[PDB]
């Protein structure tokens, strides 16, 4: 045993005397007040802590201790799990303070905005975007009431953050308005001869346009954002732009540049922040997105689980940042453990994603659509892999209503002709294929293919995947092998063009053609596709010797200017 420090003993003595010295703690130095409040959290006195943190005067001084912010994120979240709505109370208090000081000078307004920026950054880092948006709206109103140079800079820096909290809140219709306000303020800034850097705003707009599935415009603003990265930007801005740039490159089918972008982002996050930081977890989440979309699913589970374990540590349960990690790990575990049939860990994560999102967000929120979609995909495969026809009907019907709810949400938010509603159409087509309703399955796959080829060119990965699904519907079920053979050839051609001969998705097309020709004839075709499948299996076994992706990132591989310059040179 070792003697506990006089500091910690005195904190235990002050906390124990809490009723007699509740207001005297607020006169302590800002590095002692947070330790006392953390002792209140550790002792279990969540009610007293929640009463104190609901006051903006107390919480502002707590936010000034940036060393132990990882300790604060797990306290605040606990309060939000305790049932006390600390985020909305703090946002309301800040809005009231702003409404009170709207009639004042420019000295106290600048003080409140700086308090507003740290509070909004905390509320959007913890995942309370609907509650951080009010704080940033108040800050924007303060920066709008006057039109000086510093207030123009603060208005731009506040519309950058307001765009971010309207992207993670799935308010994509207000994101365009927020970007227009930011663009207006930046044009007025450049009118006076002072230029503000546009990397963070263009990166947030890239995330907006990618989340709306506007991948062409997303890549255009990706290039525009990377054209505005300097050596003096904060590491958070560079990390965010690198992440969204990698995601845009992935969905533009440009994995050769997305790899360097996202690996450099992960290296920067792990270097500056650490291995247990929320921003490092966000980089890991986007890196898992990259790895899942480059036929490298086996490593992606190792990345999402790494991303989730960081987010469960800093935040804890009942958080949207943990919920997104769950709904992404659930889909990656579903994809990885698809042929294995072991949807036990995949469903456990998808249950927590919906179990968290339903608690913290309304039933009409788009983030619930993606968590419902993954669990509906998992429930379908559990249904067809079980033997009870009662289970095969109950789970399939649950997946049906989940898919219809997700489709309704995506159709209401995006529209009839977006990529993310075509993905729900394709999933519904697969579900109807499993559910022995084929007339609707063909219609669903036709709609998904038509929407994803009207939008995403002719030879994209997504349209190839939906073509493969429709071809499996035609081959195994409808026996219309004339169309199924053509669709298999299209899917194989696109997969080979994009992923090469080592594509893991080519098995479901090679076996499909083997069964197709076994049904109709041409045993020379059966033999040729059988030996092609054997060569594919040999190549996949050769390529299966992979390593850990965090080690693939390594330490100090590139430099910040080098990656951006290489990306720009490669267009």
């Amino acid at each position: 045993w070792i003697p506990e420090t006089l500091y910690n003993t005195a904190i235990s003595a002050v906390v124990d005397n809490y009723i007699r010295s509740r207001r005297d703690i607020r006169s302590l130095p800002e590095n002692i007040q947070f330790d006392v409040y953390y002792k209140l959290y550790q002792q279990g006195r969540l009610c007293q802590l929640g009463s104190e943190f609901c006051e903006l005067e107390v919480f502002a001084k707590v936010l000034r201790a940036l060393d132990k912010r990882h300790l604060l994120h797990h306290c605040f979240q606990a309060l939000m799990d305790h049932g006390v709505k600390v985020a909305s109370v703090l946002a309301y208090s800040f809005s009231r303070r702003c409404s009170y000081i709207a009639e004042s000078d420019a000295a106290v307004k600048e003080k409140a905005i700086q308090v507003g920026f740290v509070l909004g950054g905390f509320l959007s880092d913890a995942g309370w975007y609907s509650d951080a948006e009010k704080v940033f709206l108040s800050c924007l109103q303060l920066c709008t009431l006057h039109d000086e140079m510093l207030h123009w800079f603060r208005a731009v820096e506040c519309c950058v953050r307001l765009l971010h909290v309207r992207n993670g809140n799935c308010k994509y219709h207000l994101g365009e308005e927020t970007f227009k306000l930011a663009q207006t303020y930046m044009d007025k800034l450049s009118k006076h001869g002072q230029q503000a850097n546009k990397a963070a705003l263009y990166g947030e707009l890239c995330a907006l346009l990618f989340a709306k599935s506007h991948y062409d415009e997303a890549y255009k603003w990706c290039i525009e954002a990377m054209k505005e990265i300097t050596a003096g930007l904060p590491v958070k801005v560079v990390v965010d732009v690198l992440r969204q740039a990698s995601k845009a490159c992935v969905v533009k089918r440009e994995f050769k540049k997305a790899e360097q972008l996202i690996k450099h982002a992960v290296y920067l996050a792990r270097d500056h922040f650490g291995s247990k930081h929320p921003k490092y977890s966000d980089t890991l989440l986007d890196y898992g997105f990259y790895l899942l979309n480059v036929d490298n699913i086996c490593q992606s589970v190792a990345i999402y689980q790494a991303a989730l374990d960081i987010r469960q540590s800093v935040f804890g349960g009942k958080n949207i940042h943990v919920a997104t990690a769950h709904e992404d790990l659930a889909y990656s575990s579903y994809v990885h453990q698809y042929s294995s049939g072991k949807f036990d860990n995949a469903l456990f994560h998808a249950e927590r994603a919906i179990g968290i999102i339903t608690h913290i967000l309304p039933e009409d929120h788009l983030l619930l659509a993606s968590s419902k979609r993954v669990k509906a995909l998992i429930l379908e495969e559990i249904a067809i892999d079980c033997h009870n026809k009662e289970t095969e009907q109950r789970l399939l019907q649950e997946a049906h209503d989940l898919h219809l709810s997700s489709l309704q949400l995506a159709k209401k938010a995006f529209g009839e002709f977006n990529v993310q509603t075509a993905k729900h159409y394709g999933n519904l087509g697969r579900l109807y294929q499993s559910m022995r309703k084929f007339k609707e399955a063909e219609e669903m796959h036709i709609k998904a293919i038509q929407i994803k080829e009207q939008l995403l060119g002719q030879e994209d990965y997504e349209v190839a995947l939906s073509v493969g699904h429709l071809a499996s519907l035609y081959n195994y079920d409808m026996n219309q092998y004339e169309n199924a053979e053509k669709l298999y050839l299209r899917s194989i051609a696109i997969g080979k063009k994009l992923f090469g001969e080592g594509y893991s998705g080519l098995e479901y097309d090679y076996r499909g053609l083997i069964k197709l020709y076994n049904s109709i004839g041409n045993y020379e075709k059966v033999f040729e596709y059988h030996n092609v499948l054997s060569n594919w299996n040999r190549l996949r076994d050769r390529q299966y010797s992979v390593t850990d992706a965090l080690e693939d990132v390594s330490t100090s591989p590139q430099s910040t200017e080098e990656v951006v310059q290489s990306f720009l040179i490669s267009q």
Partner: peptide, 7 residues
């Protein structure tokens, strides 16, 4: 299986 993974 008969078809590929979900999207």
């Amino acid at each position: 299986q008969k078809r590929a993974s979900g999207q």
